[PDB]
Design a protein around this ligand. Structure first.
Ligand SMILES: N[C@H]1[C@@H](OP(=O)(O)O)O[C@H](CO[C@@H]2O[C@H](CO[C@]3(C(=O)O)C[C@@H](O[C@]4(C(=O)O)C[C@@H](O)[C@@H](O)[C@@H]([C@H](O)CO[C@]5(C(=O)O)C[C@@H](O)[C@@H](O)[C@@H]([C@H](O)CO)O5)O4)[C@@H](O)[C@@H]([C@H](O)CO)O3)[C@@H](OP(=O)(O)O)[C@H](O)[C@H]2N)[C@@H](O)[C@@H]1O
Ligand SMILES: *[C@@H]1O[C@H](CO)[C@@H](O)[C@H](O)[C@H]1NC(C)=O
Lengths: 217, 218
């Protein structure tokens, strides 16, 4: 079957800079009817893919001029001019010339932008959760760059190294920034053992950690 | 006015079969071919097959022995059947119009996440992450929804039915023992926060759960 090889897997680009994504078919992809069915798709996280370019170099309706396709027989390129936060996601090429039709592996766009210090927000467990005998204490670290960050939890002045569930979004479609959620999963009974809860964010921007805390009573 | 609506199960037992109906509106099946694609973290995007306008079907050879695509032209419906499902057939299944020449009916369905498992369906519990003043920095306030203890994937979370799209962060699901948890956050101005109501809309289609949770100050 025709193999489509996309390179690179991940593509660093500066905000405002041109991106160039490569896709290589293992052999030629001209359909019997003469058309070259090379299509480029963009998939944002949580959403379905959407067509950008079809028949190698034709823009789909609603697609800005900033996107263009080119290439020849086995070697195809997507070019994005003036890369923007809205262009974030995974890019895929697709060949529909020879059955079985096949997709490339995907190219994730990584935008390069200025540093941003995280916002920190902390959230006691809700009464509705407590009612059922659980107690998730959640802290969001929002809108930072670059991606590397440390989070420290403190419970009545004693640090909680362990049992912290951390999850990360992909770059934000508005400002090309990252966000992280950090959760302490406790029981209602274990949560009420303590009074003070604190979430501390250490990020290269600042030598001082950014701090939020609450008290149960 | 172009739509590809998909209905099918979240959960299917190992070795049983999968049936998914794609309902088209906007174009006619006597004029256009419809494809089926799946997405899985293992093998990325895989093209499975196509039923062309005249009723001819072609299939990906790797699945040809267990796969069946048919349709009803008058109902605008395309049917996907896969037999003998195994654990790594877990994926999002899409009906799609793609590989276009002349027309402009390029569209993907919402997808049906099919989980191949013997486990049973559990809806989420939806808890508000009500800010308090410890959830504010500068002029902005960050709000949240915790969606806890559900199976199978997916849940979808919007804020204000999708009208609030800027500043929305939806964190990927993670497995705690045998149930999924996820959170979502929205950041808004502190000016909006006395007067405005902010709502998170959680849907778990495997269990027909549709919950609107009002987030308010602490
Ligand atoms: N030289 C070719 C030529 O010979 P003829 O002189 O005998 O015409 O055409 C032969 C096919 O004969 C026609 O068959 C159609 C029925 O077509 C299909 C079916 O719909 O079931 C599909 C056929 O598949 C092909 C093809 O072989 O021609 C290849 C596919 O890759 C695909 O590209 C399809 C269609 O063109 C796809 O159509 C769409 C699309 O879905 O994207 C939709 C259209 O609106 C249009 O937009 C086109 C684009 O322009 C791109 O082409 O795309 O074609 C094939 O599987 C045949 C099967 O062999 C027949 O048993 O079934 C008949 O149409 P209907 O009368 O409406 O039933 C028509 O009568 C025939 N002439 C081809 O085999 C020769 O090589
Ligand atoms: C699923 O497992 C089979 C072996 O039973 C393997 O050959 C096939 O390629 C796998 N498919 C995916 C999508 O991982």
């Amino acid at each position: 079957d025709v193999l489509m090889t996309q390179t690179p897997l991940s593509l660093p680009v500066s905000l405002g800079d041109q991106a160039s994504i490569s896709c290589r078919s293992s052999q030629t992809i001209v359909h019997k009817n003469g058309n070259t069915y090379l299509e480029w798709y963009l998939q944002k996280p949580g959403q379905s893919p959407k067509l950008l370019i079809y028949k190698v170099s034709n823009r789909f309706s609603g697609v800005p001029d900033r996107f263009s396709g080119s290439g020849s027989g086995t070697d195809f390129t997507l070019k994005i001019s003036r890369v923007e936060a809205a262009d974030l996601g995974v890019y895929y090429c697709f060949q529909g010339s020879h059955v079985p039709y096949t997709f490339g592996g995907g190219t994730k766009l990584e935008i390069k932008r200025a540093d941003a210090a995280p916002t920190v927000s902390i959230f006691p467990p809700s009464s509705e959760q407590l009612t059922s005998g659980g107690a998730s204490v959640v802290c969001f670290l929002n809108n930072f760059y670059p991606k590397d960050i440390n989070v420290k939890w403190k419970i009545d002045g004693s640090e909680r190294q362990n049992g912290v569930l951390n999850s990360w979004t992909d770059q934000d479609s508005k400002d090309s920034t990252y966000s992280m959620s950090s959760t302490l999963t406790l029981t209602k009974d274990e949560y009420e053992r303590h009074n003070s809860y604190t979430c501390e964010a250490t990020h290269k921007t600042s030598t001082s950690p950014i701090v939020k805390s609450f008290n149960r009573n | 006015e172009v739509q590809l609506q998909e209905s099918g199960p979240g959960l299917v037992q190992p070795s049983q079969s999968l049936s998914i109906t794609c309902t088209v509106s906007g174009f006619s099946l006597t004029t256009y071919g419809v494809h089926w694609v799946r997405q899985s973290p293992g093998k990325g995007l895989e093209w499975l097959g196509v039923i062309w306008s005249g009723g001819t079907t072609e299939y990906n050879a790797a699945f040809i022995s267990r796969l069946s695509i048919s349709k009803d032209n008058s109902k605008s419906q395309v049917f996907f059947k896969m037999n003998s499902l195994q654990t790594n057939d877990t994926a999002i299944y899409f009906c799609v119009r793609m590989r276009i020449t002349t027309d402009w009916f390029a569209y993907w369905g919402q997808g049906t996440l099919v989980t191949v498992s013997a486990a049973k369906t559990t809806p989420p519990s939806v808890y508000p992450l009500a800010p308090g003043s410890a959830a504010q920095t500068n002029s902005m306030v960050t709000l949240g929804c915790l969606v806890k203890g559900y199976f199978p994937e997916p849940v979808t979370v919007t804020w204000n039915s999708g009208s609030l799209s800027s500043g929305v962060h939806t964190f990927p699901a993670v497995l705690q023992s045998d149930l999924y948890t996820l959170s979502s956050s929205v950041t808004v101005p502190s000016s909006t926060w006395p007067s405005e109501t902010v709502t998170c809309n959680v849907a778990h289609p495997a269990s027909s759960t549709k919950v609107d949770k009002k987030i308010v100050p602490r």
